[PDB]
From Swiss-Prot:
Claim: tRNA processing is one of the keywords in the record: no
Signals that turn on the gene: Up-regulated in response to all-trans retinoic acid (ATRA). Up-regulated in tear fluid of patients suffering from dry eye disease. Up-regulated in response to the pro-inflammatory cytokines IL1B and TNF, and the bacteria E.coli and P.aeruginosa.
Shown segment, full-protein numbering: 43 to 254 of 256
Tissue specificity statement from the Swiss-Prot or TrEMBL entry: Highly expressed in lung, upper airways and nasopharyngeal regions, including trachea and nasal epithelium (at protein level). Specifically expressed in the secretory ducts and submucosal glands of tracheobronchial tissues (at protein level). Also expressed in the eye where it is detected in lacrimal gland, eyelid, conjunctiva and cornea (at protein level). Specifically localizes to epithelial cell layers in cornea, eyelid (basal epithelium) and conjunctiva (at protein level). Detected within acinar cells and ducts in the lacrimal and Meibomian glands (at protein level).
PTM note: May be N-glycosylated.
Name this polypeptide is given: BPI fold-containing family A member 1
Main subcellular location: secreted
Length: 192
């Protein structure tokens, strides 16, 4: 069970993401809060769209080292199910969504002596978004929803998961941090 840095870092990121409440965060994404038909406001009724997020899932992290060995890139594959509901109701719709966050880990050498583990870039992996139909002329409602999902979810997921990633990095095992940073800054591969 003891392994090298690469497998240790990977299982360390995964543990922290979970224990940091990643699933909680996926489940609570303000999907339809980040958005000419005001109206709904006006009577007393409201919505009557509703998106429950269920089935949050973290898949297997992936780790590659830069060619110069100075940088790591983490792939954080995530999975949620979306059920479309409507308190005039028997779900309207139901979807499987998959998405990668790519977190970039650097070691950078402070002007004094010290060396720091930095979360560099942390973005959604362009083209990693995937929407499936699980289970009425719903076709119009789909790919409308898909169109919304396509230009809202990735920045929304990024914006909720990347700070967690940042939290997890800083809270890592000190000695693990100290070996990771020393190999990266000396450009030595360990993610082989």
């Amino acid at each position: 069970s003891p392994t090298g840095l690469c497998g240790s870092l990977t299982n360390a990121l995964s543990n922290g993401l979970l224990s940091g409440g990643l699933l909680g965060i996926l489940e609570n994404l303000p999907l339809l809060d980040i958005l000419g038909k005001v109206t709904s406001v006006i009577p007393g009724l409201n919505n009557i769209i509703d998106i429950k997020v269920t089935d949050p899932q973290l898949l297997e992290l992936g780790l590659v080292q830069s060619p110069d060995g100075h940088r790591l890139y983490v792939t954080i594959p995530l999975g949620i199910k979306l059920q479309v509901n409507t308190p005039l109701v028997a779900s309207l719709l139901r979807l499987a969504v998959k998405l990668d966050i790519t977190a970039e880990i650097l070691a950078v050498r402070d002007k004094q002596e010290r060396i720091h583990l930095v979360l560099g870039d942390c973005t959604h992996s362009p083209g990693s978004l995937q929407i499936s139909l699980l289970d009425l002329p719903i076709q119009g409602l789909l790919d409308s929803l898909t169109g919304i999902l396509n230009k809202v979810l990735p920045e929304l997921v990024q914006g909720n998961v990347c700070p967690l990633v940042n939290e997890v990095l800083r809270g890592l095992d000190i000695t693990l941090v100290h070996d990771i940073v020393n190999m990266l800054i000396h450009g030595l591969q360990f993610c082989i």
